[PDB]
């Protein structure tokens with residue numbers, strides 16, 4: 001009957017997907033749908049499917065929907081067997097995986113209970129520590145020598161033992177083993193440990209991770225250091241480590257009241273911990289190209305970019321460009337044989353506090369994807385590098401994300417270089433010099449690439465100028481890391497009644513719900529797709545107007561040679577080398593290829609004011 | 617006594633990261649950077665057993681990569697004077 005009722009749920013679902021899945025009429029997407037899905041999957045014959053939940057919830061009034069959700073672990077077998085049925089019917093090596101998506105609801109990891117156990121659910125969080133993909137049995141051919149092997153079955157649920165029955169023969173048993181690795185079916189898998197989304201956690205409860213195992217072609221879909229959304233397949237894993245928890249803890253002591261006395265006691269504690277599982281993994285969290293064109297056409301969209309960057313911040317116009325030109329980087333490629341050029345860019349904002357230098361930062365971690373924000377002094381160490389994680393268990397050498405490196409080909413933002421002392425700064429130097437992060441700790445040696453831009457905000461020795469002092473002496477970070485940051489864009493705020501009035505006005509404006517009507521010419525959402533478009537260019541200047549650049553380099557150092565009591569610097573050749581990446585940056589900005597001598601002049605003047613601010 | 621072959625060129629060229637259970641037991645070429653590696657060790661090659669009570673030598677067998685088992689029944693007996701590998705007349709091959 002339970003077999004019969006369950007089987008009824010089978011037939012009901014099978015009828016569902018065979019019954020019309022689509023009400024869309026006329027222009028479409030006209031019916032069916034899912035048949036089209038089976039067939040589109042039959043195109044490349046990779047044997048897994050995606051079918052939406054919402055439809056299924058709507059059709060039957062939900063009796064079937066609820067019947068699936070609540071008892072879902074009960075109802076797996078009927079479902080994939082049903083899919084196998086339809087496949088057998090309409091279609092001609094059998095591995096099938098069914099994953100719903102688009103649930104009506106989202107549940108926080110902290111809101112997970114045991115009443116939703118074994119039942120499909122939705123959980124969104126920040127992925128951490130992915131783990132290399134390892135095979136799994138679930139179908140194995142294992143038997144004794146006597147009298148024959150090749151029996152292939154069982155080990156369904158995680159055990160992993162053993163053959164169920166019809167041993168040996170003729171030694172009939174009981175017994176055990178032997179397992180073949182020559183005959184069995186394997187799938188996947190990779191484990192990932194997901195964390196609660198940073199923004200959500202209840203004070204001061206602090207985040208708590210849970211573990212989600214990835215089987216299915218859903219493998220590798222997850223990404224380290226990313227928000228993701230999962231659908232349930234929820235289950236349980238047993239845990240030895242809970243003892244002295246305290247109790248009272250349940251046990252297995254068997255009931256022997258059958259049979260008769262003429263095995264022993266056989267007691268095994270059962271202590272489980274909840275760990276989520278995943279069938280479906282998404283990274284959530286033509287008409288537009290017309291807009292993109294509309295952006296590249298206009299002659300002002302540069303200026304639009306600049307003015308529209310950081311609404312919260314008021315003016316300065318320097319650090320606007322300073323922020324954007326990191327998002328759009330140079331060629332960072334070639335020149336071989338040999339050692340590779342840089343490429344990317346760096347900036348360190350310096351100034352008397354209250355200058356809202358931090359607002360930029362928060363705006364960058366807000367705006368651009370692949371951006372990590374730390375306040376270090378508390379880095380603390382690694383932090384910006386990898387642990388590496390050991391053990392796992394089962395071989396370990398699994399690597400933590402983490403901090404700096406988990407943001408890669410991107411903009412990492414650090415407050416206060418001046419607080420982190422010696423230890424880590426050296427590591428950062430190792431990142432911005434050798435470009436690679438070499439990691440060896442008490443175990444497996446390693447090399448892990450991080451190619452990144454580093455935006456820092458560094459407070460002066462006394463938090464002030466010191467206009468008369470050399471900037472070299474003011475910032476108070478060591479020479480080698482200093483010379484790799486080009487360039488600083490120092491800000492100091494001084495009292496001007498017009499500007500003062502404008503500040504008070506603007507700030508009071510901000511703290512007013514009205515008017516919040518202050519708006520940038522570009523919306524924060526579109527500026528991303530614009531930028532990502534502008535990233536796909538490979539700006540290259542063959543143009544012989546590059547000759548001009550030389551004299552420009554040349555024009556720059558001469559007047560700055562005498563006196564030496566000017567802002568020098570030198571001006572270092574690395575600044576010639578810097579003008580390049582700056583140029584290419586502006587090329588990225590304006591979509592123009594081979595650029596102009598004019599844009600070169602813009603990058604130039606930019607560096608110039610960045611110098612003069614150092615003069616006094 | 618033996619020449620085993622290295623083959624040459626079979627793309628594929630699975631870089632490293634992308635491999636699945638479909639690829640195991642099947643020939644696969646791979647590229648990547650050598651990291652720290654263990655020293656050189658001997659491997660059993662031809663395995664031989666002096667037994668105990670049943671005298672000697674029980675002769676060379678081939679095992680294995682990597683099993684080396686089970687040496688079930690031989691030579692008088694087969695028990696209880698059962699098998700212990702010896703240093704002499706067992707040949708080894710390097711392993712890393």
Ligand SMILES: Nc1ncnc2c1ncn2[C@@H]1O[C@H](COP(=O)(O)OP(=O)(O)O)[C@@H](O)[C@H]1O
Nearest residue numbers: 312313314315351352353354355356357358359
């Ligand atoms: N131009 C500006 N735009 C927005 N906020 C500003 C501006 N100038 C000052 N502020 C205010 O100053 C505060 C930021 O101080 P900040 O200069 O970041 O201190 P610190 O230098 O220690 O980081 C913010 O709370 C902000 O309200």
